[PDB]
Structure 1
């Protein structure tokens, strides 16, 4: 994608050297914002082949407030294996915060339902927010949430959403994060009889690992193809009733995939 390649180049030309928790150096910039008009096509990277399969399962998994990787396994999705403990538990990560943020007085807040309510009864609200950054539960999470905060906005019958991503591996994670949140907006919009608007992506520490330079230069030489189109086969009863088969991507013709090895 045009906006995507632009950021990659930006990190290359303006990034400063910084090491991550391990030892792998990164080229890093702080503060970046992109905008994807969802009406312009589904924001799935075409400069390299991306697979929607894992993305869909993870999203549906988040929505069920599940934090154990069993569901993902039943569907052969192994993107969380690396973080799961012996029992397949990841701790109170995303799904738990989204569907059951625990209060000091013993309640569990359903932020997803709260948001659905607001979009339907008070679309003009400036508080339609979902936060996964529960300070009191950070110590128990397999890892602190990267995409930690997102806000919805309604204007002229169009639902928009801004995501704040504290840490972003441009080459490996961003393509996945964009499609994931773009899917969420389509689902929410359908459930609220709204048209899709913009998906604004905001990042904090945006970076590229030093050992991904070749892959970056390679991808940057490819010309972005037209964006595909997301097809939602049916309109479920609620946001919690979507099924993997309900989605279909039309017109996706990307360039070959590109491997990105990680150090350990």
Structure 2
């Protein structure tokens, strides 16, 4: 049962993780290198032992797909998760005094749609500039499913100093066999308590989107971590969470036939039979 991998990873960090401080100095238990496999066949891995912010997951992903790098554009949809990184104060602390509030720099949206183009600001038109990794991935899946190079890469060493934050999700790779689309994520840093459930849901959702566009069935999502960590103030709550028995995973329904990845709207998606334990 898929959720047990996530719970197993939490268990492994609690027993075997080492004390390690972070950028803030708040401190973590930490393991380097982990891998879980979540099936996507007739099930969607939205974690049940604690409710995941589904709306956040879906809006953030649509925001990525539009190529936006404007925190305000996601904030308008009710999803505040990138606001603090776009605030006047946070931007100033990075030496970006000339930058408009909300401008996160060349993050996910830009990298996925315009890798290697020259970043100016969040409002600039980038049409036909840089590599549209998202579409090349869709195209390669359609014309040459056997290809071992189906990669979308958010890690851009040249652009790192211009970003409000360097991406947690360095890259993902897709794979096709037996009409099934699988995806593997390389996530360099994982907050196991707060980030990871949301992170698992994002890339599972991305895979469902691309599978729908390409006429394939969802296969596996493979979650690979670098620095897998639990914050010390999360140990006691997570101990409570480990006690709960997972309910069956919900399903994800895609409510109409959609032709291009850019056409997906939030209302196209329905989470069915989601039954989480209280927060």
TM-score by shorter chain over 0.5 = yes
User: Residues 29 and 231 of structure 2 are in contact (CA less than 8 Å); yes or no, is this contact kept in structure 1?
Assistant: yes
Shift of 1:31: 0.5
Q: Secondary structure at the match of 1:49?
A: coil
Could you list the runs of 5+ residues in structure 1 that have no partner in the other structure? 258-264
Structure 2 equivalent of residue 183 of structure 1:
205
Shift of 1:235: 2.1
User: Residues 256 and 268 of structure 2 are in contact (CA less than 8 Å); yes or no, is this contact kept in structure 1?
Assistant: yes
The root-mean-square deviation of aligned C-alpha atoms, in Å, is 1.2
User: Residues 28 and 231 of structure 2 are in contact (CA less than 8 Å); yes or no, is this contact kept in structure 1?
Assistant: yes
Structure 1 equivalent of residue 277 of structure 2:
255
Question: Take 2:226 and 2:56, find their aligned partners in 1: how far apart are those partners?
Answer: 25
Q: Secondary structure at the match of 1:70?
A: helix
Structure 2 equivalent of residue 8 of structure 1:
10
Shift of 1:50: 1.6
What is the 5 A alignment of 1:228-243?
Answer: 228-243=250-265
Structure 2 equivalent of residue 18 of structure 1:
20
Does the alignment pair 1:205 with 2:227? yes
Structure 2 equivalent of residue 214 of structure 1:
236
User: Residues 40 and 227 of structure 1 are in contact (CA less than 8 Å); yes or no, is this contact kept in structure 2?
Assistant: no
User: Residues 212 and 258 of structure 2 are in contact (CA less than 8 Å); yes or no, is this contact kept in structure 1?
Assistant: no
Structure 1 equivalent of residue 91 of structure 2:
none
Structure 1 equivalent of residue 125 of structure 2:
none
Match of 1:69 among 68, 71, 78: 71
TM-score when normalising by structure 1: 0.95
Shift of 1:164: 0.4
Structure 2 equivalent of residue 144 of structure 1:
166
Shift of 1:73: 2.1
Shift of 1:80: 0.5
TM-score when normalising by structure 2: 0.90
The range that moved more, 182-191 or 34-43, is 34-43
Does the alignment pair 1:196 with 2:253? no
Aligned structure 1 segments of 4 or more residues deviating by more than 2 angstroms: none
Shift of 1:103: 5.0
Shift of 1:201: 0.4
What is the 5 A alignment of 1:21-100?
Answer: 21-86=23-88, 87-100=101-114
Q: Deviations over 1:88-143 (max 9, x none)?
A: 11110111100001258x94110001101100111110000000000000001111
Structure 2 equivalent of residue 130 of structure 1:
152
Q: Secondary structure at the match of 1:102?
A: coil
Equivalent residue pairs, number: 256
